[PDB]
Design an enzyme around this catalytic site. Structure first.
Site, short mmCIF file in Angstrom:
data_model
loop_
_atom_site.label_atom_id
_atom_site.label_comp_id
_atom_site.label_asym_id
_atom_site.label_seq_id
_atom_site.Cartn_x
_atom_site.Cartn_y
_atom_site.Cartn_z
N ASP A 12 0.80 -1.20 0.00
CA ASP A 12 0.00 0.00 0.00
C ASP A 12 0.82 1.24 0.00
OD1 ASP A 12 -1.93 2.16 0.69
OD2 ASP A 12 -3.29 0.58 1.12
N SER A 53 -7.16 4.05 -1.37
CA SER A 53 -6.93 2.60 -1.33
C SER A 53 -8.17 1.78 -1.67
CB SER A 53 -6.63 2.24 0.11
OG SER A 53 -5.41 2.84 0.41
N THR A 106 -8.03 -2.11 1.91
CA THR A 106 -7.38 -3.05 0.93
C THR A 106 -7.90 -4.46 1.12
OG1 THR A 106 -5.47 -1.53 0.74
CG2 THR A 106 -5.14 -3.82 -0.08
N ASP A 228 2.09 2.81 3.43
CA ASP A 228 1.34 4.05 3.13
C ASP A 228 1.28 4.95 4.38
OD1 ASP A 228 -1.03 5.45 1.65
OD2 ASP A 228 -1.86 4.93 3.62
N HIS A 232 2.22 8.93 4.61
CA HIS A 232 1.31 9.99 5.10
C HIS A 232 1.97 10.73 6.25
CE1 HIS A 232 -2.38 9.38 2.87
NE2 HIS A 232 -2.52 8.13 3.29
N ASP A 270 -1.32 -0.10 -4.72
CA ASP A 270 -2.49 0.65 -5.16
C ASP A 270 -2.25 2.06 -5.70
OD1 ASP A 270 -1.87 1.46 -2.45
OD2 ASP A 270 -3.95 1.39 -1.80
MG LIG Z 1 -4.25 -0.60 2.52
ZN LIG Z 2 -3.55 2.87 -0.37
ZN LIG Z 3 -3.08 6.43 2.15
#
Ligand SMILES: [Mg+2]
Ligand SMILES: [Zn+2]
Ligand SMILES: [Zn+2]
Ligand SMILES: C[As](C)(=O)[O-]
Ligand SMILES: [Mg+2]
Ligand SMILES: [Mg+2]
Ligand SMILES: [Mg+2]
Ligand SMILES: [Mg+2]
Ligand SMILES: [Mg+2]
Ligand SMILES: [Zn+2]
Ligand SMILES: [Zn+2]
Lengths: 340, 342
Positions: A12, A53, A106, A228, A232, A270
């Site tokens: 991710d 996502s 996800t 991910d 962030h 993704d």
């Molecule tokens: Mg995810």
């Molecule tokens: Zn994502």
């Molecule tokens: Zn994200």
């Protein structure tokens, strides 16, 4: 050219730059170097240039473009059959592994159908209606500390699940279960920096051994979820430690596939997060020193970069070239001949 | 057992990572020529001394097949000259050409015909042109040939080696067809940017090289460079970067149109490194929230970065370029598929 089994590994939020960190920050050669067939996907949703996502994973699980936040539903918000449901009709065993809560967008797009990804209590209840054979992840709260007061675990046990809320066990502990679920944290699993260790690789190895028990064909989605979250937070050591763990799982999958000879392994993401860059180290005289890398970010959100796809095993040539994300679904169905 | 290409076109987008390439999918009218490629690889770009490469070491990796220090032009880590793909092409009776939107003496084009201790030695690099077997070139950099600190007239030496030189404009093919070698120097330093009216120079020049170098049924090798993608990156200037890579994508379509009609030509598209940490971020709306419907490009550095870089290949032998490898293997893979004598 026809794989019996499919393992899909989703990192991710990892673009090529996040992938590249494993070539500078990981001991040894990254497992990415094992792949020869490489393609590229365009990750926009049905309505947004930058995907989230939810629509990102639903493009893989269901083979359609949909709106950001959708779980397993089309752009018009109607439920669509996922690869898990299709796999069930074709007698294929299925499993979903994640380092986030198992209800996060996800994994959720592989076994639920919900209008919005934040409906995580509805998503947990949706598992009671799925043919999922194996799962492992966090998210115990969504099954047992709910607004509606329901005990979803009881329902799952009614559907032939054994549930373990204490630790990943040896395969000898679950080999005789009909279905197996691990809920190993209340919300997300610990970070690698907080001691999660080799959960992702171990859980993916368990899923393989479990779902192939009786010479059954299988489909597994395993997700490196917290990459991910590193992006962030613009937190480089967080991001890098999570993506190195994900590269360990890729080695797990590939070691099994190479021996098995009848397994296709697809690795992709993704979308990218953070504009993570392997920039030159910055010094104050502020100038660059190209001898050394100092990771930097430009955003706290997702980006629209094309994303690399890696494929190894029978049919892996179908995944080269440049295509839209949702075609991952169609390419899998094509090479496996699983019917819809 | 792959097919063997007769001809090779290497197109370099300087400074273009995958996020730069991806901008053509959102900011170019129509479909990017990148979508014609099936075979795709990844290169690791570090130099012999630096995790983050410059254009000189990264282009010398391609032209000479070695890791070397940042700033080296066609020389090994110990500063000794190394035999280049263009020098191998000439010994195999291959016609050679180089195109760039920078000065022709700038580090990427220089690494394919010169050998110099440092990319800053542009007057020595122009002089090296006179000892190379290059048959064709186009780009800027007239100052390095006629307005030199050593007041030498290099142009006169080039013509002495069978070059015809034009400093006026690119011509059609029939204009130059009888010339034994052809050089275009069309600006004093860099060619104009796309935003300042350069227009279709890069595709036109690449097309012209292809016609010129294939006279009399001759095999050829061309390196054409989208030089200023990098400079858009360095400046953290989105519209500059984006107009330059859109133009490079046009050049890709020119190369690929030829290769498809020809059927005996390998086309390789790569970059030397990424620059600027260019990112297709969500647009900011205003006090500031991200709106994922649209893109607002952002940057995180003024300098290069160490990300792995995509390689695209089409044509006979292109399967050699898939997987993940060191940048300097581009050289060795070109050599291997062409079966040229080393
Ligand atoms: Mg995810
Ligand atoms: Zn994502
Ligand atoms: Zn994200
Ligand atoms: C701010 As900097 C030295 O990475 O261009
Ligand atoms: Mg539902
Ligand atoms: Mg940290
Ligand atoms: Mg250059
Ligand atoms: Mg010299
Ligand atoms: Mg601008
Ligand atoms: Zn460069
Ligand atoms: Zn640069």
């Amino acid at each position: 050219k026809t794989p019996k089994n499919v393992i899909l590994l989703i990192s991710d939020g990892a673009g090529l730059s996040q992938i590249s960190s494993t070539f500078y920050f990981k001991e040894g050669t990254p497992n990415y170097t094992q792949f020869k067939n490489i393609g590229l996907i365009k990750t926009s949703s049905s309505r947004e240039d930058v995907t989230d996502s939810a629509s990102g994973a639903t493009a893989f699980s269901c083979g359609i473009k949909t709106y950001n936040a959708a779980i397993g539903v089309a752009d018009d918000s109607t439920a669509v059959k996922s690869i898990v449901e299709i796999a069930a009709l074709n007698n294929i065993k299925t499993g979903v592994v994640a380092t986030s809560s198992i209800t996060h967008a996800t994994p959720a797009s592989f076994y639920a159908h919900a209008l919005n990804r934040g409906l995580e209590e509805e998503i947990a209840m949706d598992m009671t209606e799925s043919d999922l054979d194996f799962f492992a992840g966090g998210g115990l709260n969504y099954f047992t500390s709910r607004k509606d007061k329901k005990d979803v675990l009881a329902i799952l046990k009614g559907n032939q699940f054994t549930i373990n809320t204490t630790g990943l066990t040896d395969f000898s502990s679950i080999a005789s279960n009909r279905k197996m679920g691990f809920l190993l944290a209340d919300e997300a699993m610990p970070t690698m920096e907080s001691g999660r260790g080799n959960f992702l690789s171990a859980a993916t190895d368990l899923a393989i051994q479990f779902l192939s028990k009786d010479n059954s064909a299988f489909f597994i989605m395993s997700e490196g979820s917290q990459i991910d979250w590193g992006g962030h937070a613009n937190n480089a050591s967080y991001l890098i430690s999570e993506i190195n763990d994900f590269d360990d799982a890729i080695g797990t999958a590939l070691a099994f596939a190479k021996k098995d000879g009848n397994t296709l392994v697809i690795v992709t993401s993704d979308h990218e997060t953070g504009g993570f860059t392997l920039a030159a180290k910055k010094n104050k005289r502020e100038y660059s020193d190209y001898t050394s890398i100092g990771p930097s970010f430009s955003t706290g959100g997702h980006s629209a970069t094309l994303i690399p796809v890696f494929a190894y095993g029978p049919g892996s040539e179908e995944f080269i070239g440049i295509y839209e994300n949702n075609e991952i679904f169609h390419k899998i169905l094509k090479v496996t001949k699983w019917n819809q």
